[PDB]
Amino acid sequence: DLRPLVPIEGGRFATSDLNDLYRRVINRNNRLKKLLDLNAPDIIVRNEKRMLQEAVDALLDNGRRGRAVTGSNKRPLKSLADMIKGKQGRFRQNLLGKRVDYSGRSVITVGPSLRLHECGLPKKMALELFKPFVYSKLRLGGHATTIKQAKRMVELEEAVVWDILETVINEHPVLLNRAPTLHRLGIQAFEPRLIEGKAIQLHPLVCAAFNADFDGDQMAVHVPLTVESQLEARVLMMSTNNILSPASGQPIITPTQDIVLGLYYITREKEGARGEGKLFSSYEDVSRAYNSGTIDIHAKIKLRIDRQVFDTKGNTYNEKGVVNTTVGRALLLNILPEGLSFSLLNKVLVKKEISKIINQAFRVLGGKATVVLADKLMYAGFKYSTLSGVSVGVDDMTIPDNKEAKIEEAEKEIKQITEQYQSSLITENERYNNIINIWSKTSDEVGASMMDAISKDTVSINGEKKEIESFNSVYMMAKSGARGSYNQMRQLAGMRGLMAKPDGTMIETAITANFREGLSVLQYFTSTHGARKGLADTALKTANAGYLTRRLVDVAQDLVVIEEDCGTDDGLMFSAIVEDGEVKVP
Amino acid sequence: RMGHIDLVCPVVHIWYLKSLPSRIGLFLDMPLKNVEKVLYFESYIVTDP
């Protein structure tokens, strides 16, 4: 039964490759015995005695010495030793593998209403994964007495089934996992709650740990069963325990993409707005006012605050007075828990500061305070990021005005370099390099121009025209670290520039157009080279990093903190790692 | 519940011969190919001095 001959469909059978090698060594031994009996000449005795050794070696592991035997299908047979080695073998395949039971998998969707410890669960997969628990509770409940009874009553989905299911999973956490599991945050525990439909929902604030996005990724889900297990998942594995990353103390649940857009948007300022310079006593006042529709949310007002603040040394001193704030920021005053100073919210709130808020909260106020704060931060950022209707047209991408002449200068200098060459007055390689530098510097200039061409807007405000920070869409999407970077803006409004042929040696013709303006056939063709190269380079890496982390896990798989103190008195000497130009790490 | 098979003439466990270094070779203090020749019925070798 480790080399079976089970019959399967088509009235046929499925031997194992071992049966054949056995069936060969056997009758070779038999013929050998018959020969030794009949007293044959020693030549054929030798031939049999050698054929036997060959079959034995094939059985043990064929291919070690010869041209390993094959069956009709002409495959090299799967010998004995070939079962306990290799990735498809026996050790790292079925001893650390083990397709398990009580599991399921489907497509993920967002569900921005949950809390940081919940997840949607299609009632079908729930009915399936918990079925025996349902059986037990029905039997004990007195609605069925046998097992065939309960199985026949669940097959037709009685109404009481849904209620008893919902009470089964009141506090029975599950696990969730995404396929390439690189770090321990690749697995966390949530508490389900029934949903209709056929897709898993998970709180958005964790899609950074699982490194997931909703273009089709599918997650698996396993259930714990025991009393120790489904308590170990609760205490060591629930999402509300994993705030900071094991790699570095930096938090991992910071708002990410347009939770940041809304915050940064409602936390800016404007000079001449409605209701400017007004007076308000408390947050509820500003709320009542703003809902009435008279004030502009970016206005500057004066709020009188009074609340405790925690000092470094465990003190807690009172803070009061009048502070010059903005209508927007005061709207965030409600969520800040008592214990943190208002000085955190009283700025423009780009991402690097939201993370600051969360870190500060954790280190002084606790852990639960931080998850509740992130709750409210998401709940608010989502709200105000749609009353602002941010969107993106094409006129929001503004081409700078001096582009044509800035190109003319460059191409004229290029003609001059070609002149210096054509009369053999200059060599080749130097011409090439100087052309490269020409195009590079001019592209840099035309790129730096659109920054001022899109991040500044002048207006003849009452009295005169003064320049102010623009409220442009595409500028805000990247000055708030929400989603973007300066380079993409360049390639949208500026010019592409230098495209490296496969090696990396730049092409002596740069692309002068840009995406808002489109490209000619040749200009697109020149880019597809690097496009394909960079695209192919990831797929031909995805196996390498896994290789290295596998090696490393092997090297140190058995390092465990076992004792409080080792008592010794020797270590190392640390110092700020200067690099002749900067400290770069204090 | 295993079984077994009776071998008329003994036969060398391939592993301890072609595992590099060959434990048979290291034991008998001879180079491998010299052993395989004996094994492949290509020479003889003094067993009785």
């Binding site: 030549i43 031939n47 010869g66 041209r67 | 395989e36 492949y40 290509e42």
Partner: peptide, 18 residues
């Protein structure tokens, strides 16, 4: 000749047609 060739069929044909 006795030149390390492993596959037995030759090591038999050689002596066979001697």
């Amino acid at each position: 000749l006795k030149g390390k060739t492993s596959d037995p069929i030759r090591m038999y044909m050689r002596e066979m047609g001697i």
